[PDB]
């Protein structure tokens, strides 16, 4: 329509934000950023509909403007900034550090963690290229573009970063038999320990993946997210660890935790 969009209704906003179909017929549009539109969590929906630390966007703007908040080691004083996958946020108040990861129910969880677990993150390499003047570089899944990494670091690998700079703490390559995390599809939030893969040269590299209950499935190689090696995750993981039990098994779980 004659130019960029600026508005966003509810019911075009994604499902997993869990925004309610009442309460005004307009929704918070994620302004552009280092993450996409849909696999992103605005800070407004975060603060206003995950913690209830505020009730209204006016209050949230007060918060963002008084700068209790900071992402990537930076204040990021916008009410609708994309808090994407894996991302880190640090709050002086309560001295908390929340991390933005997924749950198996297909939602952005709220992973309470410490300042060092915030001070490092994870990032999937999106691609690698050679910039001008012969500077090899790569770019991640969070719009971060980084220069002079190891040549051993290639595509589909994952990096662990300092968060005071965009430099590397370490890296993990992609190969058969490594612990991963899923981003896309019915498997949103699974953790399923690569068992093998398949090429289909021409499009849609596919991967057969199963979690420790033997339970297997198949996913796209650009929807997966490698988090390190089998056993140790490089971070702390949320309730469930990407399992997707049955409706009845979860019913029994909660009925035990009545």
């Amino acid at each position: 329509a004659r130019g960029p969009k600026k508005h966003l209704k509810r019911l075009a906003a994604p499902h997993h934000w869990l925004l309610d179909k009442l309460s005004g017929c307009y929704a918070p549009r994620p302004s552009a950023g280092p993450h996409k539109l849909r696999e992103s969590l605005p800070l407004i929906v975060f603060l206003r509909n995950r913690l209830k630390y505020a009730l209204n966007g006016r209050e949230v703007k007060a918060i963002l403007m008084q700068r209790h908040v900071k992402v990537d080691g930076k204040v990021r004083t916008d009410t609708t900034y994309p808090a994407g996958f894996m991302d880190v946020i640090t709050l002086d108040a309560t001295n908390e550090n929340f991390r933005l990861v997924y749950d198996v129910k297909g939602r952005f969880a709220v992973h309470r963690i410490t300042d060092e677990e915030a001070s490092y993150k994870l990032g999937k390499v999106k691609k690698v290229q050679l910039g001008k003047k012969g500077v090899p570089y790569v770019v991640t899944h969070d719009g971060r573009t980084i220069r002079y990494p190891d040549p051993n670091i290639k595509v589909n690998d994952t990096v662990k970063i300092d968060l005071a700079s965009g430099k590397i703490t370490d890296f993990i390559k992609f190969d058969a038999g490594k612990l991963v995390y899923v981003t896309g599809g019915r498997n949103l939030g699974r953790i399923g320990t690569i068992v093998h893969k398949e090429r289909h040269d021409g499009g849609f590299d596919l991967v057969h993946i199963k979690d420790s209950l033997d339970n297997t499935f198949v996913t796209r190689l650009n929807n997966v997210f490698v988090i390190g090696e089998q056993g140790k995750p490089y971070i702390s993981l949320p309730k469930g660890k990407g399992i997707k039990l049955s409706i009845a098994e979860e019913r029994d779980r909660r009925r035990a935790q009545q």
């Binding site: 209704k9 509810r10 019911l11 179909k21 009442l22 005004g24 017929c25 049955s246 409706i247 009845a248 019913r251």
Partner: protein, 184 residues
Amino acid sequence: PRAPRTYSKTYSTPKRPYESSRLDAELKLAGEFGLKNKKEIYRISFQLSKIRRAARDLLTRDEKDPKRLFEGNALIRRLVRVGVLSEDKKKLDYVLALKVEDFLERRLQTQVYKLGLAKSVHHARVLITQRHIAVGKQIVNIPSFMVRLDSEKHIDFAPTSPFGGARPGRVARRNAARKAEASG
């Protein structure tokens, strides 16, 4: 632009209107359970028909069909929680068989009459709508309740109305003022 509020009925009219058998049976039911509306009767029959369709198209399925297991167990759970069904009949065939009479006796008005706070189901109706009642610690003025049996244990008259004390009555104060004026 505001997404429109869903609405959907809770009843269904008779396919064929004038069947004397149908009319007399449902009149018996209305005149015993203290009802005003074939609307209400159709409504309860419609709920029963929905659950019965579910029962049919579930027992169509094999055993250990996890859909059958989950949904049938939840159906059992709500039926025992509401009390139309027993605490020992979970085999789904009693569910095929259950009755509008069962629903009606689990309603509040005739329950009130059985408990004896009415002297007539119609007396229960007028007491309900005049708020001389509360099933828990909050007043209710609706006959159609489908009690959950915790209410049954917790029944009492309205605390904030006579027959549970706390006030003599509107016309009670009226009569008292009348006799005060007479003595004056």
